[PDB]
Amino acid sequence: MVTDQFGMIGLLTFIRAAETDPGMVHLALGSDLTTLGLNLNSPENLYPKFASPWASSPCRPQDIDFHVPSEYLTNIHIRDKLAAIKLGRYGEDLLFYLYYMNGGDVLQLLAAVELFNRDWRYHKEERVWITRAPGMEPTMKTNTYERGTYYFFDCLNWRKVAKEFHLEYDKLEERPHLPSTFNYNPAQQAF
Amino acid sequence: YDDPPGLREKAEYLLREWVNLYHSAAAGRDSTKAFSAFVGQMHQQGILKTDDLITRFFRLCTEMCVEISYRAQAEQQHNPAANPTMIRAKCYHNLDAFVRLIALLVKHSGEATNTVTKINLLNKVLGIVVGVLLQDHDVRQSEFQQLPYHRIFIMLLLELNAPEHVLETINFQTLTAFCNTFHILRPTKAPGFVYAWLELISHRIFIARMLAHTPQQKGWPMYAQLLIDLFKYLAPFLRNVELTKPMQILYKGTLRVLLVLLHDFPEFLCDYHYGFCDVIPPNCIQLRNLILSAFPRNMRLPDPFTPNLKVDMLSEINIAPRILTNFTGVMPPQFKKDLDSYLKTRSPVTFLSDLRSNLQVSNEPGNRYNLQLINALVLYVGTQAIAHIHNKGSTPSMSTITHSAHMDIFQNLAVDLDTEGRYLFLNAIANQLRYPNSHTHYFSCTMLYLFAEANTEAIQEQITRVLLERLIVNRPHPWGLLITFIELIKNPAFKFWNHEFVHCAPEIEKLF
Amino acid sequence: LTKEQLYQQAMEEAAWHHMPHPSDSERIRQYLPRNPCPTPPYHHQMPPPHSDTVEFYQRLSTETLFFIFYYLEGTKAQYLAAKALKKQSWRFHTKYMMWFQRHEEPKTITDEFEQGTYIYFDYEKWGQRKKEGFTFEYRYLE
């Protein structure tokens, strides 16, 4: 019987130690690679949408510097006349776009605030945006919850759909809060 | 004494003016006019008179951009209430301007066919920026920041990878220049620049240009070398038990880029596995699993779950793998001489003990065994054995690999080494258990035979330790490894379950 | 660890305090820079799947497409948005730098120019306006 760590004993102790500390998993059980941002089960390549070593998600179309026609670039010409970005005067479609596309960014939070102003509430558990339907009042109204037919936004089909919900006020989110973290960098916490 | 007087003022004026022009209302034609005018004034100021003054100019501009970045960061730290976006926008402003200037200078250097001048200017500027980086790193140390150099390098890279003919004709030399640049800026040479450095390697367009767009796979060796540099830097910290958060993030990033390379360019990791394994510490199972799981696209691996025989892969067993790493050169001339002599004459038998004395060169603290020499020994002896068996007139089987000078080495190293030595040895063997080929088969039979005809139970415990360890971790798992381990369980000709180490701990017994 | 390696670990720890920002790699976004922030777990940390396809952009409203076109200059997003606009029968003008759609079939149609009544999107007031008797020359189309 091997009386060192090169035997089965060292292996089991490594297993227990890795079960204890997450910063020691590199030698024992290893980490789940499928939990990472990239999709290992894809027929096509994934390198053209590879952002950074610390990115938890692939590149967005608004992150790829594509070679557009010279006619399209107009920012240099209309840098004085083009309207400023005001979230208040946008359609709910554009708001949903700015919400879903700008994940992990302040723009998602701002869009969430505007939607909150349009009487939309975000269900934490259902992971969708829900609002009141025209002419539709809740069947039961209690101090803790209310149920009935409401309007939620399907992001899969990109269309407003009606569905019966059992909305609890605890499951709903109040007004979104804006962070004050100076020089925040997500890649710093990719450990 | 450094520069002639008044030169810094010329450089400052010119750089600032170009910054003004670059962000000015200027399209393509306007950029051509502004560029011609700026080059004109640049000539007039007596800067392009000699290569020396040019070097001084580029260096001064670089240093100015750097100091601007430092001022921006200091301004941000002193006034945290200030918008970080604008603080970054200043650095972006000046750096993008300078980069555009450099690119435009490289493109219009000499005639159209004059590629030599353009490339020379490229290596010139790159070398200058590198020098400035090294000096700044050496003088600031902990105060060193990567933003200016990072942005300069990546933006210049993007600029020189533009879809135009002139840049296309010199693309390979450009990639070469950037590769040499990235090699000089090794993390072991420039630690504080590590993160950005990784982002310079794992960047999508760089990977695309190096491993995909470059024909005849000529970019593979350089990128492989860069990866070897990364692995070299990571090695001493990964060998340690505890891992700090910076190292953890760097490691996660390495896992991501390696995953990308595995999914997109498996042939690359396949062809250069030996060097990577020769650099990566034996206790790092995930990395070696990422590298050993690499196999050609056209190959369809047989089901390891329910194997019928070795007749499904019989056409691929006779196919020898490709090793693009000179491992025979690692061995000392005399040692290799004696090795071949014994592999030819099987005499004397003292060569075994002398060999064991020759692979544990104890002259430096910390390391007790020459790992690379061990790997080289295993691989060389194995390949030589396969060649000998084939030249004999038969194929390497369970009974054909036995009773030879080649096997004597394996047996001796198995029984006459300590736990550490045999650990590194068995790892060296298990590193060849990959996709169906001659090597994985020969070394599978070798591993299993070493288990069977083992003197003590300790050796068997070690083999099982390795084969299990490389399978307890998460995916991916090498094919030949899994097969070799399956053979220990399925075939009753080993009496695996009769051993004590299987019945050692309740967790272990319940694991099987 | 070696003395040199301890120095390397220390230096890496130092550079860890200021890791390169995601916007250090990409061209400077003029209107929509990347501004990271701690986003709640129940919120979507990543965009829905198949949001890189043109069909996804077809579902978008016109105003959204114009937003993408004008505020995301020189990106793949602008490309896809422009494709979605062209497929929605929107012609881009070179001199005026805006998109036009046929409100009604024009009376005078020639190869030199196309005069008629159309609709467009004013980037200054941010909205749709109608133009009567507008001469859409083909000299400003590509």
Short mmCIF file of C-alpha atoms in Angstrom, two decimals, chain C residues 24-116:
data_model
loop_
_atom_site.label_atom_id
_atom_site.label_comp_id
_atom_site.label_asym_id
_atom_site.label_seq_id
_atom_site.Cartn_x
_atom_site.Cartn_y
_atom_site.Cartn_z
CA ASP C 24 -10.35 48.58 -24.87
CA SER C 25 -10.51 45.97 -27.62
CA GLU C 26 -13.30 47.39 -29.77
CA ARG C 27 -13.45 50.71 -31.64
CA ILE C 28 -14.67 53.65 -29.57
CA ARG C 29 -18.47 53.54 -29.50
CA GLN C 30 -19.66 57.12 -29.91
CA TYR C 31 -23.26 56.91 -28.71
CA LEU C 32 -23.52 53.55 -26.95
CA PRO C 33 -20.29 52.73 -25.06
CA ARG C 34 -20.11 49.55 -22.98
CA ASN C 35 -20.85 50.46 -19.37
CA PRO C 36 -20.75 47.34 -17.13
CA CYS C 37 -22.69 47.18 -13.85
CA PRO C 38 -23.84 44.62 -11.24
CA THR C 39 -27.01 43.23 -12.84
CA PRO C 40 -29.47 41.20 -10.68
CA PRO C 41 -29.51 37.42 -11.35
CA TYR C 42 -33.22 37.28 -12.20
CA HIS C 43 -32.60 39.77 -15.01
CA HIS C 44 -31.28 38.52 -18.36
CA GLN C 45 -27.48 38.57 -18.21
CA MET C 46 -27.31 37.65 -21.90
CA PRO C 47 -29.44 38.34 -25.01
CA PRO C 48 -31.93 35.68 -26.25
CA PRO C 49 -30.62 32.98 -28.63
CA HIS C 50 -30.71 33.49 -32.41
CA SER C 51 -30.55 37.26 -31.91
CA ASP C 52 -27.69 37.40 -34.40
CA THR C 53 -29.93 36.36 -37.30
CA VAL C 54 -31.57 38.75 -39.76
CA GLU C 55 -34.95 37.13 -39.08
CA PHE C 56 -34.63 38.38 -35.50
CA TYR C 57 -34.17 41.90 -36.86
CA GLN C 58 -37.22 41.46 -39.10
CA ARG C 59 -39.42 41.24 -36.01
CA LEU C 60 -38.13 44.59 -34.74
CA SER C 61 -40.09 47.81 -35.20
CA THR C 62 -38.89 50.40 -37.72
CA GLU C 63 -37.90 52.92 -35.03
CA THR C 64 -35.72 50.25 -33.43
CA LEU C 65 -34.02 49.57 -36.76
CA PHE C 66 -33.33 53.27 -37.26
CA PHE C 67 -31.98 53.46 -33.71
CA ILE C 68 -29.57 50.62 -34.47
CA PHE C 69 -28.61 52.16 -37.81
CA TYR C 70 -27.81 55.64 -36.47
CA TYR C 71 -26.43 54.89 -33.00
CA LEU C 72 -24.47 51.72 -33.78
CA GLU C 73 -22.37 53.01 -36.67
CA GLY C 74 -19.92 50.66 -38.38
CA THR C 75 -21.10 47.47 -36.69
CA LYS C 76 -22.73 44.19 -37.68
CA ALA C 77 -25.85 45.50 -35.97
CA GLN C 78 -26.03 48.40 -38.43
CA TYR C 79 -25.54 45.89 -41.24
CA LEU C 80 -28.39 43.62 -40.13
CA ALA C 81 -30.62 46.62 -39.42
CA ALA C 82 -29.95 48.05 -42.89
CA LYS C 83 -30.71 44.66 -44.44
CA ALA C 84 -33.97 44.51 -42.49
CA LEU C 85 -34.83 48.01 -43.69
CA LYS C 86 -34.07 47.27 -47.34
CA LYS C 87 -36.17 44.10 -47.14
CA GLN C 88 -38.95 46.27 -45.72
CA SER C 89 -38.77 48.38 -48.91
CA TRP C 90 -36.70 51.24 -47.47
CA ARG C 91 -34.27 53.09 -49.73
CA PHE C 92 -31.29 54.94 -48.25
CA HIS C 93 -30.35 58.36 -49.62
CA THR C 94 -26.73 59.51 -49.85
CA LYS C 95 -27.04 63.31 -49.71
CA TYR C 96 -29.77 63.45 -47.06
CA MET C 97 -28.46 60.37 -45.23
CA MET C 98 -31.88 58.96 -44.33
CA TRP C 99 -34.25 56.16 -45.34
CA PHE C 100 -37.28 56.59 -47.60
CA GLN C 101 -40.37 54.51 -48.36
CA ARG C 102 -42.99 54.88 -51.09
CA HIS C 103 -46.11 56.34 -49.49
CA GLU C 104 -47.71 55.97 -52.92
CA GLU C 105 -46.57 55.08 -56.45
CA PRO C 106 -44.88 58.16 -57.98
CA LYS C 107 -46.39 59.95 -60.99
CA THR C 108 -43.12 60.66 -62.81
CA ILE C 109 -40.67 57.76 -63.05
CA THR C 110 -37.44 58.01 -65.04
CA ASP C 111 -33.96 56.47 -64.99
CA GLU C 112 -32.42 59.82 -64.06
CA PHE C 113 -34.57 60.49 -61.00
CA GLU C 114 -37.77 59.35 -59.27
CA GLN C 115 -40.10 62.15 -58.19
CA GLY C 116 -43.15 61.52 -56.01
#
